[PDB]
Design a protein around this ligand. Structure first.
Ligand SMILES: Nc1nc2c(ncn2[C@@H]2O[C@H](COP(=O)(O)OP(=O)(O)NP(=O)(O)O)[C@@H](O)[C@H]2O)c(=O)[nH]1
Ligand SMILES: [Mg+2]
Ligand SMILES: [Mg+2]
Ligand SMILES: [Mg+2]
Ligand SMILES: [Mg+2]
Ligand SMILES: [Mg+2]
Ligand SMILES: [Mg+2]
Ligand SMILES: [Mg+2]
Ligand SMILES: [Mg+2]
Ligand SMILES: [Mg+2]
Ligand SMILES: [Mg+2]
Ligand SMILES: [Mg+2]
Ligand SMILES: [Mg+2]
Ligand SMILES: [Mg+2]
Ligand SMILES: [Mg+2]
Ligand SMILES: [Mg+2]
Ligand SMILES: [Mg+2]
Ligand SMILES: [Mg+2]
Ligand SMILES: [Mg+2]
Ligand SMILES: [Mg+2]
Ligand SMILES: [Mg+2]
Ligand SMILES: [Mg+2]
Ligand SMILES: [Mg+2]
Ligand SMILES: [Mg+2]
Ligand SMILES: [Mg+2]
Ligand SMILES: [Mg+2]
Ligand SMILES: [Mg+2]
Ligand SMILES: [Mg+2]
Ligand SMILES: [Mg+2]
Ligand SMILES: [Mg+2]
Ligand SMILES: [Zn+2]
Lengths: 129, 14, 313
RNA sequence: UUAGCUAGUAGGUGGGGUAACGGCUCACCUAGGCGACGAUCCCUAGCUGGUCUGAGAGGAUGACCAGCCACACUGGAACUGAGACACGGUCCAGACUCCUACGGGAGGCAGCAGUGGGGAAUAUUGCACAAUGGGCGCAAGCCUGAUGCAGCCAUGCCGCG
RNA sequence: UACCCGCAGAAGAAGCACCGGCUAACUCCGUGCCAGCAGCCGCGGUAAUACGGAGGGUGCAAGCGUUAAUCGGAAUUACUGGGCGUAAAGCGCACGCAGGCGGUUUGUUAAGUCAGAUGUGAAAUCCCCGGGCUCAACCUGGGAACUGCAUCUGAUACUGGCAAGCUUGAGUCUCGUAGAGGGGGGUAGAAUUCCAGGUGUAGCGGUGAAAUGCGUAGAGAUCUGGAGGAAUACCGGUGGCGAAGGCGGCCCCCUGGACGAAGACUGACGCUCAGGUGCGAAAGCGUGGGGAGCAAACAGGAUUAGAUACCCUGGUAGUCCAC
């Protein structure tokens, strides 16, 4: 059902980016904040706010160029049916280093560019292309 | 198509 | 390749991919045919070469190179098949029928029209006559006396009784004969009583229905008389191909109607709806039976329903 | 288109056993053991370091080199010895061949070549212990068809005219 | 022996395959869908660069072609990296074990994973830089590689386990609404056929046209009355309900799910499903009933070349109920 909420998060982002929606909302969690805050610090989105404490509701502000999709495509990589893990030297790049790959490690959620100075590996979340 | 299907039986090579 | 002696021989049968060719002495020798051959029938004299035996004494086939000219030919057209010749090079046809399952008269009439276009003399032969009574035999004899006034010889035989086989053989020597008929009319049984042929195959005989007949034996198989001549078996045929010529030739397809032409009122006549038809007056007189006259315009009304779509050779 | 298999089987006691632990073996006691994560049955196959193909992932295979296991006419058994259930040791049986005075005996080329035969198809019935390795001996020395060589086979690669 | 000196003279030392396209190279003659050619496409019956030969050329080379075998091309068993409305493919549907997977918050474990280190992954092969044999093949130095496994120390974001939770997932109650949902038992009135009676007369019936059939024992038609059987006009509609096949007169009884409103309440109790389990149009089968109408086989008459089918008059099984 909602068994991969990160894939449910990526579904709501990709639809509203293409359908010219100004802002979207979604149910919040601890992990969804730890991904959207990275995308805010990597120029893909604008802002995120939390609403509700017994029903945590996350909001995202979209981002356009002249009405053109900033996040062109995003690809869920690991999944509950098949887990994907890499080492500190097998971290894949997205568009030969243009896009970023969201990898969650023990030092928090960061990119593969940020994992070079960290020197760790773990679970690939999504290819932010 | 599902990876979990191929755990029970792999792809049948002719 | 590597063919043998060009010589003249008689083709026994036809099998599509190959054919059975009898030599000049009585040797059964199967041969295939040339790609440029347009048609090959049963009992057609050909030019052929018997290949070359690979093993000494054991040959597989030869080839049939050329086809000689036809004396006669039996061409009958068909829907979506075209005009196809069945047999050729013959002098006499023997129409063979039986009282079971049916004895029709319209099956008799259109072989008469065909034989007038081939200059061949057909002979009416009835089989299975032992199953009727003398009241029934006299009525069928009365129906065949009409076919005796018109000049055709009528011999009424039976295979399981051997009646009248000896007068049937006297007029049949020295000629080849097609035993034409419908399905299950006693064609193969009369082949057994006349020839004395090899009883180890002796035929395929399955004709068992509720009120119908089955055509078990195939197109034509060649054999020889003890005196002289050849036999040609016929399929069980229920077809009538009249795509050949004009209905002026239908007037020529009947014997006694020759001498009554040029006697009607007009120079052209349909002979059904025209007032003063002298042919129709001859039927009303009783010199021509009305069974033949009603079947005659049934032939003409059959050409009103066969002609409908179109067919041309 | 193999779903149930298994009674020395699974476990325990005690005795015996081997160089060592152990149903390895024996009496007794218990009824468990294995198995849809493929037991069991059938068919096929020496395995691996590798070779080849492929951008890679994979795929096919296991000749020459090296490692290990099995086997030495077929089957079974034990002795000897530190080490074998023993390729050129023995014993028994079977199969085949040879010798014979008819009663008996002899033999194991999957060692080097080589013959017969099979198959589309694969070699000289060669030289040497000079070197290397090994065996024996205090060493000298001897032995080694391992190996070092040579010939044949355009069989492959590479180089030249 | 390699190696080296010296002698003589181009003297001793080049072939095979192809030539329509794929695929590098074009003309001529002979032959006449014959002979042949060929991996594919397909060439050749009177002008064939495709057959045969000649001329000339091309591609290779002391080798060149052919055949057989493996992988690649083939993303043509698709993990990387395929599809299932109609090209091959979503079980007829449903329940559900094992199995896979799982909301959200905190703590804990450090299992999975990640970081570091140790031991090990024989040599040879392959790769990197070298050396040597005149060169190359080949031989060889060291390094890398062998993406493996085991152990130890760490990090705790995610997955897993434990612990405590939370409510939006999924459930529970109440008040209600709609429905051909199923099963069981009654009941209604047309229509069909049969039977009884009455009035009434020469055809009825059937088809394109006729015939079989029925009827002066009075058919048919009409009316009265009765019996039996099966189905429910109109309502009735891309209308409703049910997991699906399906389900239709009315009424009662038993009973299943669906949906809406307002709150209260349990606290992930969930999704999914190989075997397994049940339902499942009609035909058909077993046993015993039942019998109008319709109707395989079959009977009869037209049709026809034959009619087996079509058309018509009849008619058994079956259609009905229980098991
Ligand atoms: N009682 C009787 N039966 C006969 C007579 N002649 C032939 N029959 C039977 O009729 C049947 C048909 O004979 P058959 O010759 O096979 O007929 P056909 O016409 O050759 N058939 P097909 O069309 O297959 O070739 C056979 O069973 C045969 O025994 C006869 O005179 N009397
Ligand atoms: Mg016959
Ligand atoms: Mg013990
Ligand atoms: Mg060797
Ligand atoms: Mg070895
Ligand atoms: Mg041994
Ligand atoms: Mg032994
Ligand atoms: Mg030996
Ligand atoms: Mg040998
Ligand atoms: Mg041989
Ligand atoms: Mg070209
Ligand atoms: Mg050629
Ligand atoms: Mg020419
Ligand atoms: Mg060379
Ligand atoms: Mg092949
Ligand atoms: Mg592939
Ligand atoms: Mg496809
Ligand atoms: Mg299809
Ligand atoms: Mg379905
Ligand atoms: Mg602590
Ligand atoms: Mg090594
Ligand atoms: Mg090394
Ligand atoms: Mg090396
Ligand atoms: Mg060099
Ligand atoms: Mg957790
Ligand atoms: Mg009624
Ligand atoms: Mg509570
Ligand atoms: Mg039955
Ligand atoms: Mg019927
Ligand atoms: Mg029944
Ligand atoms: Zn006239």
């Amino acid at each position: 059902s909602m068994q991969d909420p990160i894939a449910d998060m990526l579904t709501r982002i990709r639809n509203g980016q293409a359908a010219n929606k100004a802002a979207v909302t979604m149910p919040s969690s601890k992990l969804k904040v730890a991904i959207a805050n990275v995308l805010k610090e990597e120029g893909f989105i604008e802002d995120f706010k939390v609403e509700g404490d017994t029903k945590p509701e996350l909001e995202l502000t979209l981002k356009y160029f002249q009405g053109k999709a900033v996040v062109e495509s995003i690809q869920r990589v690991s999944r509950p049916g098949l887990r994907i893990y890499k080492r500190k030297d097998e971290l894949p790049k997205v568009m030969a280093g243009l896009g970023i790959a969201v990898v969650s490690t023990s030092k928090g959620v960061m990119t593969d560019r940020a994992a070079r100075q960290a020197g760790l590996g773990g679970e690939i979340i999504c290819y932010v292309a | 198509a599902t990876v979990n299907q191929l755990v029970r039986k792999p792809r049948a090579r002719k | 390749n590597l063919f043998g002696e060009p010589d003249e021989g008689i083709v026994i049968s036809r099998f599509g991919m190959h054919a059975d060719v009898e030599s000049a002495d009585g040797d059964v020798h199967r041969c295939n045919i040339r790609r440029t051959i347009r048609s090959l029938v049963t009992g057609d004299r050909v030019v052929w070469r018997p290949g070359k035996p690979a093993a000494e004494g054991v040959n597989v086939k030869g080839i049939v190179e050329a086809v000689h000219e036809r004396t006669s030919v039996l061409t009958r057209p068909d829907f979506y098949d075209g005009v196809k010749p069945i047999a050729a090079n013959i002098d006499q046809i023997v129409i063979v029928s039986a009282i079971l399952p049916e004895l029709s008269l319209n099956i008799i009439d259109r072989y008469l029209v065909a034989c007038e276009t081939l200059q061949i003399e057909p002979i009416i032969v009835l089989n299975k006559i032992d199953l009727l009574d003398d009241e029934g035999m006299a009525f069928v004899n009365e129906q065949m006396d009409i076919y005796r006034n018109i000049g055709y010889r009528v011999l009424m035989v039976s295979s399981h009784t051997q009646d009248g086989l000896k007068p049937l053989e006297e007029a049949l020597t020295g000629r080849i004969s097609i035993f034409a008929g419908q399905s299950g009319v006693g064609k193969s049984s009369l082949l057994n009583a006349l020839l004395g042929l090899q009883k180890e195959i002796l035929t395929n005989d399955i004709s068992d229905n509720s009120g119908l007949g089955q055509h078990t034996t195939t197109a034509a198989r060649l054999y020889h008389f003890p005196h002289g001549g050849d036999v040609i078996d016929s399929p069980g045929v229920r077809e009538f191909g009249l795509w050949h010529l004009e209905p002026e030739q239908i007037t020529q397809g009947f014997v006694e109607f020759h001498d009554y032409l040029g006697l009607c009122k007009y120079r052209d006549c349909k002979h059904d709806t025209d007032p003063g038809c002298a042919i129709r007056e001859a039927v009303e007189e009783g010199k021509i039976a009305e069974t033949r006259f009603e079947n005659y315009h049934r032939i003409l009304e059959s050409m009103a329903q066969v002609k409908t779509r179109k067919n041309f050779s």
